[PDB]
């Protein structure tokens, strides 16, 4: 398919690796009882192994010569061959939660600078104000692009600068 990679459900080293992990787990399994808790834990392990290999073969991942899933990081090639779930949807999910954390921290900083003890509200966290901003932070991309377009996202050149500049 992409880059000479076969799909994992078509790959043979993928099936060999699945069979090898089952072989190691059953060689460890064959030295216990039946209803014993080590045997129960190893059968749960084998169930999770089979479920994991079936889910990775179901998700349409691409395997190499080693039988291991390879990820495709190109928006157009991923959206063309059905691989947006591995890099593209995770990167927009990450950027949503990372801007969430950063915007809630920025709103807490701006809220606590407007008092007579900003360092005291930085050492001892104002929990109601922090939870208020943490719930209100869900509209952070809209609020961020609005603060961008008003010219209030950015401080002017009243910043601290060195002698050189």
């Amino acid at each position: 398919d992409i880059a000479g990679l076969t799909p994992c459900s078509e790959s043979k080293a993928y099936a060999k690796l699945e069979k090898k992990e089952l072989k190691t787990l059953e060689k460890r399994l064959k030295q216990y009882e039946a209803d014993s808790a080590p045997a129960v834990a190893l059968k749960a392990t084998m169930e999770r192994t089979k479920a994991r290999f079936a889910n990775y073969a179901k998700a349409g991942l691409l395997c190499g010569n080693d039988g291991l899933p390879h990820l495709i990081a190109d928006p157009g090639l991923a959206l063309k061959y059905g691989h947006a779930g591995e890099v593209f949807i995770p990167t927009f999910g990450f950027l949503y939660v990372a801007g969430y954390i950063g915007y809630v921290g920025r709103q807490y900083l701006i809220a606590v600078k407007g008092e007579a003890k900003p360092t005291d509200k930085e050492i001892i966290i104002d929990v109601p104000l922090a939870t208020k901003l943490a719930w209100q932070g869900a509209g952070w991309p809209l609020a961020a692009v609005q603060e961008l377009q008003r010219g209030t996202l950015l401080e002017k050149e009243e910043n601290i600068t060195v002698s050189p500049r």
């Binding site: 509209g139 609020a143 609005q146 008003r150």
Partner: protein, 217 residues
């Protein structure tokens, strides 16, 4: 006044004359998106456009979907109508989408420049004869002239009532379209079929039983 929660405090940006005079004001901004008045103007416009296209869309779902259960109008399911129509059609869907992108982009840019400047699309000379009938009607998002032919917006004693009926039917049609998408992914049948199943057995056929919407139970 009326609110989405009795006893909750109304946000201070939704309690001003400019916000209370809008339409459908119930004090619902818990995420604080409309604290900026320019943002609230832009979001008023975005709500009006999503309301009107959601009503037109959900009417195109329901009325053929209701009448296809009666005798006339053998209309396919709304998640199959694009395929059935493009088999019936003459053009490929890419060319049809390109034509609708140009034709919508013209009109959209007209609305965009009206949002930027209210007295904008009435430049004398810029249109052949459109230019006289393409100003606003002193309230942005509510144009006049060729839009609204029948003159229903002429009597002032009906005007807030027409506004509030529009914003309620629009929000309810947006809920209806999100429902159409959700039910389609969950059940696999049409929305009239979902309504017939909830009427045939309400206490056993719902979203608590479909095995998708809450899978912990």
């Amino acid at each position: 006044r009326q609110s989405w929660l009795p006893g909750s405090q109304i946000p201070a940006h939704l309690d001003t004359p400019a916000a209370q005079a809008l339409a459908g004001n119930f004090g619902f901004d818990p995420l604080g998106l409309g604290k900026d008045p320019v943002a609230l103007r832009w979001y008023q416009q975005a709500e009006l456009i999503h309301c009107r296209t959601a009503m037109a869309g959900v009417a195109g779902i329901l009325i053929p979907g209701l009448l296809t259960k009666a005798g006339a109008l053998n209309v396919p399911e709304w998640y199959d109508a694009g395929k059935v129509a493009i088999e019936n059609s003459f053009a490929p869907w890419g060319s049809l989408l390109a034509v609708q992108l140009f034709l919508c982009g013209f009109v959209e840019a007209k609305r965009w420049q009206d949002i930027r400047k209210p007295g904008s699309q009435g430049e004398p000379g810029s249109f052949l004869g459109f230019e006289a009938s393409l100003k606003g009607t002193s309230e942005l998002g509510y144009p006049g002239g060729p839009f609204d032919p029948l003159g229903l917006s002429k009597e002032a004693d009906k005007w807030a009532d027409w506004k509030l009926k529009e914003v309620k039917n629009g929000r309810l049609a947006m809920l209806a379209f999100l429902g159409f998408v959700a039910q389609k992914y969950a059940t696999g049948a049409g929305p009239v079929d979902n309504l017939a199943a909830h009427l045939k057995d309400p206490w056993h056929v719902n979203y608590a039983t479909n095995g998708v919407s809450l899978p912990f139970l």
